[PDB]
Amino acid sequence: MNANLFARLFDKLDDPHKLAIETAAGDKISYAELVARAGRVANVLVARGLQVGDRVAAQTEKSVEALVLYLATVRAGGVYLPLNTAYTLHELDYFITDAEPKIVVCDPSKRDGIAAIAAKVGATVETLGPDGRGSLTDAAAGASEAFATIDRGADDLAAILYTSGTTGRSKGAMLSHDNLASNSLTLVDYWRFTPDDVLIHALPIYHTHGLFVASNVTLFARGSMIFLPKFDPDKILDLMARATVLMGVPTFYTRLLQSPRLTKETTGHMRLFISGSAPLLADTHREWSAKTGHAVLERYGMTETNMNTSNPYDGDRVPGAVGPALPGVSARVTDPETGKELPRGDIGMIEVKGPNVFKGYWRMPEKTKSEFRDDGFFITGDLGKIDERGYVHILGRGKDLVITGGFNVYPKEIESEIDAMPGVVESAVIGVPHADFGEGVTAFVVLKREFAPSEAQVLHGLDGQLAKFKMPKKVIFVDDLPRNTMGAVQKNVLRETYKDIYK
Numbered sequence: 001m002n003a004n005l006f007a008r009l010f011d012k013l014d015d016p017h018k019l020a021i022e023t024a025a026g027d028k029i030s031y032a033e034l035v036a037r038a039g040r041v042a043n044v045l046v047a048r049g050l051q052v053g054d055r056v057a058a059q060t061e062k063s064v065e066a067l068v069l070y071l072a073t074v075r076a077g078g079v080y081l082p083l084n085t086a087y088t089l090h091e092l093d094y095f096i097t098d099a100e101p102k103i104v105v106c107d108p109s110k111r112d113g114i115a116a117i118a119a120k121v122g123a124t125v126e127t128l129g130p131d132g133r134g135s136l137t138d139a140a141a142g143a144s145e146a147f148a149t150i151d152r153g154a155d156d157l158a159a160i161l162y163t164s165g166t167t168g169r170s171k172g173a174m175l176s177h178d179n180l181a182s183n184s185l186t187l188v189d190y191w192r193f194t195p196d197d198v199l200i201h202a203l204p205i206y207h208t209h210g211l212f213v214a215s216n217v218t219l220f221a222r223g224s225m226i227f228l229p230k231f232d233p234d235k236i237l238d239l240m241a242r243a244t245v246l247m248g249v250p251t252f253y254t255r256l257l258q259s260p261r262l263t264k265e266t267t268g269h270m271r272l273f274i275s276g277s278a279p280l281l282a283d284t285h286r287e288w289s290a291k292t293g294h295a296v297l298e299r300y301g302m303t304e305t306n307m308n309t310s311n312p313y314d315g316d317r318v319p320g321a322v323g324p325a326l327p328g329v330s331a332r333v334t335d336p337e338t339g340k341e342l343p344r345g346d347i348g349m350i351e352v353k354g355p356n357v358f359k360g361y362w363r364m365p366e367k368t369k370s371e372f373r374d375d376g377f378f379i380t381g382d383l384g385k386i387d388e389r390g391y392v393h394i395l396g397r398g399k400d401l402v403i404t405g406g407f408n409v410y411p412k413e414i415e416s417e418i419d420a421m422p423g424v425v426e427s428a429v430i431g432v433p434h435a436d437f438g439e440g441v442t443a444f445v446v447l448k449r450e451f452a453p454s455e456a457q458v459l460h461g462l463d464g465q466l467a468k469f470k471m472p473k474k475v476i477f478v479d480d481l482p483r484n485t486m487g488a489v490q491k492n493v494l495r496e497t498y499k500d501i502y503k
């Protein structure tokens with residue numbers, strides 16, 4: 001009856017000695033051992049001033065100790081607030097001032113600088129390094145394992161995750177215990193996770209994917225994970241011989257496809273490859289199936305909504321689509337302006353509703369109101385369509401739409417045309433200010449080493465395929481596209497760098 005996520009996970013534990021986590025060093029941690037670790041750390045949090053509802057902010061390198069801190073925070077009735085490991089002291093100041101955590105956990109090498117920030121809000125600072133050592137660990141070594149998991153209701157907060165910051169300054173999403181439990185429980189069934197599953201976990205844990213989807217699904221299912229610090233293709237390829245699931249982002253798949261070790265034989269023990277967090281291109285899906293014989297399962301979620309849709313485990317996994325709405329989740333497509341639902345197949349704003357959807361943005365009630373329809377649907381900001389079979393197709397972010405000379409131009413279809421050309425690795429299409437057209441469609445293209453065409457050849461190639469209003473006004477060759485630490489393209493970086501090209 002306790003809705004606390006920790007209690008949902010562990011209050012009844014039938015097989016306590018089963019493996020939960022293998023660390024990168026090869027240490028093995030049982031379910032019972034994980035629970036006990038979380039008990040010690042929960043007691044530390046209370047000993048360091050945690051009261052129910054208080055935020056615990058964590059910026060640390062990835063380790064099992066860092067995962068335990070998440071579980072312990074939730075267990076103790078706190079609100080877990082992970083922060084991108086790369087955020088500078090200056091950047092952290094915004095998040096700590098916004099969230100006003102009671103406790104901040106950071107890397108030992110940054111304690112002095114973070115202590116000064118923490119002082120502004122009266123927070124206590126503990127440390128945890130990449131080896132799992134630090135003041136938090138010292139405090140936990142003498143703490144009691146026994147901890148009475150705090151009573152929480154379905155709608156009480158478990159975490160605040162800040163969005164990735166792709167379209168603007170990151171916003172804090174308030175996530176409840178039921179948001180997290182309902183979503184992972186649904187996914188366990190939908191993806192047929194069992195106690196026999198072994199997940200290769202190579203994702204960051206400050207993002208919803210690596211933190212909630214990977215960890216909560218595995219732990220509810222009573223499977224295990226192999227907990228790697230970063231993406232390493234050869235290590236991942238090595239582990240596939242003794243694992244069953246990989247959760248990845250599209251860049252995992254494009255990079256693994258460059259390895260000559262990626263074969264049917266190397267992947268033959270694997271049950272399931274999942275992709276999320278950015279668009280898996282249909283060509284990449286097909287390349288994966290051609291090389292390995294596996295059909296990648298793509299799913300779509302956001303910080304604010306957890307997972308909304310998924311390609312079916314036991315049905316057609318459709319290249320370029322993110323699947324139908326998950327059980328319990330409603331998805332529709334609406335006219336961006338009027339908000340009325342569109343006929344199936346028409347392009348508009350994707351909206352979602354369900355127990356997965358967050359409670360709003362932290363201390364931003366006005367912005368929260370503006371992103372919810374009157375009937376409770378959340379406006380995703382993603383444009384797309386739902387086909388006759390109910391599969392959602394994401395055509396792009398609303399923020400990426402380019403208005404030029406009175407026309408709406410959808411960059412994905414221009415990017416598709418360019419990426420189809422021989423000698424092209426990938427492209428990003430944006431608008432930047434243009435005195436004649438409002439915005440000028442501009443294509444940034446990453447070329448292959450040998451087979452590369454010129455600016456003019458690209459435009460000539462597009463001229464035959466594309467209506468005149470959709471044509472890029474210029475093509476710019478770049479060495480790579482800017483991406484965040486999760487692998488998502490950062491089009492605002494290109495918009496800033498190239499803002500004056502038509503001036």
Ligand SMILES: Nc1ncnc2c1ncn2[C@@H]1O[C@H](COP(=O)(O)OP(=O)(O)OP(=O)(O)O)[C@@H](O)[C@H]1O
Pocket residue numbers: 163164165166167168169170171275276277278279280298299300301302303304322380381382394396397488
């Ligand atoms: N499978 C997918 N296919 C296409 N787009 C995806 C997929 N998964 C995630 N996305 C995109 O990523 C977004 C969610 O990313 P996240 O919550 O990490 O922050 P962000 O939207 O990148 O940053 P911010 O909200 O701060 O601008 C989605 O709204 C969508 O635009």
Ligand SMILES: [Mg+2]
Pocket residue numbers: 163164167302381
């Ligand atoms: Mg977003």
